[model samples]
Target: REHWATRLGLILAMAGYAVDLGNFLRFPVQAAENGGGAFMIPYIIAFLLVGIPLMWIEWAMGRYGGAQGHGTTPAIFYLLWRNRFAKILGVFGLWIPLVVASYYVYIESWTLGFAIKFLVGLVPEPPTDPDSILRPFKEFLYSYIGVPKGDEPILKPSLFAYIVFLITMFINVSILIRGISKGIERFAKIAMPTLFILAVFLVIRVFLLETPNGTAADGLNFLWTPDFEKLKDPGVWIAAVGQIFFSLGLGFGVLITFASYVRKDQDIVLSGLTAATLNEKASVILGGSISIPAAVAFFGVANAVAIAKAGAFNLGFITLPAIFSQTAGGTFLGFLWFFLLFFAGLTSSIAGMQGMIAFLEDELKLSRKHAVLWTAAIVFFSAHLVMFLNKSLDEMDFWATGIGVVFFGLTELIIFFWIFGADKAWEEINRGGIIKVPRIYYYVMRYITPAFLAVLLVVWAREYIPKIMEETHWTVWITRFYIIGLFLFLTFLVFLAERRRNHE
Candidate 1:
């Protein structure tokens, strides 16, 4: 029932959800690994083809559903399709956020714990081993996230780590309880701006440094220099598309859920474009800017390349902190980086939970307080289970948060445009607009976006499913089954809700 108090609040809230630590950390690694600036060629193409239009579709879908007093996605589908399985399939939208959030909050806690340590000088300094400054970071990760193999007492979660995890969950739940306008929107207005300011200051300091090992300018060149040869690989294009999809927080229910709060005539065209632009610029220009340059400056281009190959977490949690250690005010810089990241992670977690809470409130007719408590209880226990999974968490993450979105995105497009009828979908998209979306997007959304999503889904399942099967252990199997069970449980709830409505 609560709407955003102002347009600015809504814009900031959506932008907050999109621009997270991934922008700073993950995007750069993606660019570096894929064809550097050549990656940008498809990256920009994907945004226009897939990202922006999907952004509009979600907002339009949510606003359309909200007008009829529905916020959860099943109701959105039911209103559009008037079929049973139509609503049932729409459950994927809810499942994606709930499943991803269950584990993602645990990641959020890491930033919190690391930030606290940074404040007190407990964050380990760069390793004394010049050949591998990442050594200390690796040790820290093993101690925190690594599981005990046969000899290590069977388990090794830190009490401090659990405390931080609990704190992070509480903060997320607390914000949700405040409802959209007062809680989510208010927090976004403050946090999103602070995230950018912190990034700008850190970037300024990064550029000022002139490393003898490898110049910052050289690092910039490495990032922007296109490897035209990489264009030959289809995987590079896949990476760019995936980056834009994940970066914009698509294939999750948050955008639709957030847009449900907008006034009937509110202009989502501009809002969607603005949020997408913020995410893209933050990702390519600013996000791509900081980490690689700092890595090259502190550690040489060779070391930077090796660190990037190690993984994004290595680049972010390990390499970046180690780079900070080389600076005079390392502690302050580390605190600023991790704390800003904390805000980024926190805002995104809030959006994740917010979508589910809105679902409960809209469909089950629960009060916001009840929805918040129930959602928090579910995520808290599941997160602990994910933590216990230890080494298997990576596999769970790959399946749930990684390519799962591909299948869902493709399915959503087929149902909405091809099945729901493109003419009707286009009408919904253009209902209230300050800026006319060029008629070109009509073709793109109806044709191009679906085609792009289909290729992603096909390529991903072909390459990754066998890899997932090969990597399976009892732990991994249990995690995958849990994700399946969650999806079924939500679907059951949707069935019950629909039954109740019909009975009434």
Candidate 2:
């Protein structure tokens, strides 16, 4: 298999992929919603207890598996623990991305549509309603995805956005078909740098704009001011844990596939940390600085909180546009902001598909062209379910990626720490380290990490609330089968890959 052309390339790809739409929209909202300042207690703890450890562990797993000529999760899982069930379970890594990407690309397409609309000066003004910006948000969403509300039946998907989605998916498959180093690495080199530059520029842009009440400081204060009392809530901790997993790309299999391209003896210690640090900075510092602060300052805390509570879509699509419309150079900033999102989603979608492509190439011994085509076939067909079912996309994302992320992350932690044994895991981790990991990680990985994961699992299981706001039989079954089928199909592929490996 082809490898990352350079060390810088791998790090950039991993870091860039992690800083996607979620960094901009979802990350800050979780922080704000789960007790503003108080959320950091769990977020920081989870980052240490879960995020960094998994970063190191996954890099180790991938590099080790690469040495054995395996790049996909199923093979890596089997390599870590020599059992058939481990191989089957390893399908989580493979399954999560394909399923998520299928729908995620649909969401990614929204950024593209919004960007184009803003660029062409078609984006509507923020709502005139005194109470909230949600009205404008709903109208924009309804027009773009061509869904309806309250007995209205506009069932057609947006043609322009549909074209953009096709173009977006084409770019993903095009980059992917070129193989890793020439394709993924090169794209990362360009896209990640541009993304950072755009983010920094917007961060500055947002700051320079004076809020209506000239109380921009209040925005930052609202973000940073934590209520210590909220720490008692289990929900805060769970949200923190989920956010870490989401932000770090823990269960998405993107990192593992990228790391699989690293040479066996190359140091991943600094590399993993570098990526993790950048992701946190993007999600917390950059993401936090922009959306919430701008919202709070412009609309006040109550309305901003309402926008955030409306969920990520309302915050990003609905409220942000309203805020931007009120600022000078709002059009240009809006264009750049959406472009930043486009870059973020593009890099991530490319990384997302690599896991499946790696599985095909490593396991079935398919050529790059064959692998790309087949993978595209699966995603192309499955993604349409979410595309046509706009109202249900949120539900699909929750089950397929959101829940699947924690579930698979926990599975990997237990497999690597308990089944493979942490002592050996540590040895693998420290094999080519430039800086030695603290010995405490051995205990942390073995005991504390699993305990944290166990708590999250229990919380989720006991409180597994399905958010099917606009549920239909089609919506429910499509979301359910997509996830279930993803696991079964990837497991079958692993089964085939293993048989071929064992042959002769």
Candidate 3:
């Protein structure tokens, strides 16, 4: 099995994977919209219970699988359980990341595209009229991404946007083709530090901004101030846990694949904890500090709240850019902000692509370069669908991040803790640790974590399943069919791999 070159590289790669657009794009909005300070209570609790445990679970499972000569989840599960059905069940690990990367790369491209636009001074000036402040930015966003105006059905993405998507795809495939240590580790070593430095600069800039309507302190207070009343809402708790789940990038098989590259005696316990800690710091401290505070400082707390409530896309693409345009040295600052996001998104999109690449190589006996080409081909075609179809991107995100991640996570917990036995799994997790994980977590993983996941599944199903069943959109149905087809194809590959192994 391929191994990470160094512990720092491994941790940085894992941290980079964990800290994606979710940190800067999703976390602040979730916090502000779900009762700022009150949201952090459940968020921190969920991280302790669900996030950290799952991180260890995946790392231990991956390293164990690598020792057994398996990197992808399907092969890993089959090796662990000795059940024919196990490989089929493991298909989620492959399918979810592929589905996610399809659109994720496209979104990453938007960040790059925006970065270029800001660099070249293409971003429009913010409207002085308070009510229409976001109009020019919104129009620019819509036009750049080729969102249809009025009642138009099909999206015609700009030529530049499409080219940028191709460029983004080329970068991912290039790194993937270079394999694990030299490719991913080398890039993360540079990109992750660059990402943090850019974020710090932007955060400092946000802090110094003296806006007409509100102070940066107002934004910070709004984000950190506790409205204890929000604790009573079940949805708030759900949102907090969900944020932790997605923010940490769990259940996508990326962690499993990345950890599989570690040496057998490496300290995953500390590594996993460190990576998760870095992700949280990026999300809570850096991510929270940037967008929401800047929005509040420029647009006032009321408008900032309204922008956040509108959606992450609204906040990140439209409102944030508008705020940047209003600042001194706005164009350059805008370039830094979007370029920071570009790095964040790029780091994650590559990780998402790696799991599937591992599967192709491990199962089909494809070379790393061939696997990357195949993966890029899949992403290229799927991303076109995502770009051209109006609602498909959101639909794909809903299934992959929302439903697929939770379901796969529950499957992992069941197989690892229950079928494999929690006692044995605990031993695996602590085997080569630099610092021993607490004994209390064994019980938490066995009982509390799975229970939390089960509740989330139940809640999401009750809330979303009805909406899905009654959905009338053609694009959504097409997206669902695409997902289903991808799953079936992967399952077939798993079947072939099993046959080949048995024959060998």
Candidate 4:
């Protein structure tokens, strides 16, 4: 029926979806991940000008898409260009989320598995790093847990893990199928506020710990100083873009898909800006307060300081679980941490799954309920399989997160700039009638964000290429993950082309 019954509910739900795992872990580690200093500056700049505008645009588009009557696929064409080319952008939008979800939910499984293990005093931390957290889980998985060893590192998911994933997936779908107001709104009302408060609590605890260690700095400022002399070396700029995509939650398609269905002139322009600002705030506060500083305390400043440099599995899984394992109720906090992660990840995953569900219904004429069932089935199966596929999980995480994320960001900007055209796009942007976008909107979309995204794509490709290539021949099975990524991407590309042709 209605996209959301109340404007407040919509805002809260959208915010819930936006501030997922990225806010929890990615935000804090950004500067650390990108060498600390100039990284946050670039990230802040992108968030304000680029991320805000895109988020608002997606919300606006969602309003339009919701009313399109063609379901999600056709709705893209309706608001965009009303043809296949326009729809292709929507189709292309699917790439990042799908792959991201496949691996992401796998991570949720890690938290989930550990949460269960901890309750029974079966495990301490997640089996993430071979040397660290994973060391224990790996032992338990093969021994007491009965984990079947795969030929590769990413263990293929077990029946139990798969069942957990599927149940979570179905629950998420069930919520969405209830529509925005009844389902999404109620969940966000509780989850979003809870998530934020918990974040604040964690932030205070971490910073309080920091005072004892002399690392206390306000969340917003400490985030900006660039220690990486190489940050300005031009080689590190892509690190800036990747950080934005990962941290700020760009190119998930949910924004556009949901935004398309929102009410015209629903105050999205302001909402988008507010959300982006909140994103920065959450990232810095949570990342600094808990993820990074806590790691520093646990590992000592030297070891914690070296985390970003290592780049294997940074915060959520790698650093946090390892340290939390040492806490008084290490089991409880470990349980708290993953359960929080699982809950947060689920919000985003459901949003992603909704896109595919809507697509099938719109394109195939299936009923909405039927669409939800099918979407839940696919997503849950993937989530279920995530538990066992250890090596495949790594490859999926790398390819989906590394290239898939970057590609989606790049493609969206290209569509907005080249295909949509700045002049006409601006007219459409203003059509929904929110805040009056300043003249700079054209410049940011045209010159600024695009410039940032381009550098990010190239730089990431360059850095990752060498590492992946070296690891490339790691095996045919290992390399297959990349192929899986490419296949997912190409599938999106085909949809993009088709949607563009049909609508435009």
> Top TM-score: which candidate number?
3
**Candidate numbers sorted by TM-score from highest down:** 3, 1, 2, 4
Q: Candidate 2's residue-wise lDDT over 152-187, tens digit each? A: 322467788889888888878888888888888898
Poorest lDDT segment (10 consecutive residues) of candidate 4: 211-220
Judge candidate 1 against the unseen true structure and give its global Cα lDDT, from 0 to 1. Answer: 0.82
The clash count for each model shown is: 0, 1, 0, 49
Q: Which is the leading candidate under lDDT? A: 3
What TM-score would candidate 1 get against the native?
0.96
Candidate 2, residue 78: the lDDT equals 83
Native-vs-model 2 lDDT? 0.80
Q: State the lDDT of candidate 1 residue by residue for 268-373, as single tens digits.
A: 8888888888777777777777888988887777776686787888778877887787788888888888897899889899998887788788888889999999
Candidate 4 — what's its lDDT? 0.61
Residue-level lDDT tens digits of model 3 in 262-308: 88888999999999999999988899999888888887877766868
Q: Quantify all predictions' global Cα lDDT against the true fold.
A: 0.82, 0.80, 0.88, 0.61
lDDT of 4 at 369: 81
lDDT of 3 at 135: 87
Q: State the TM-score for model 3.
A: 0.98
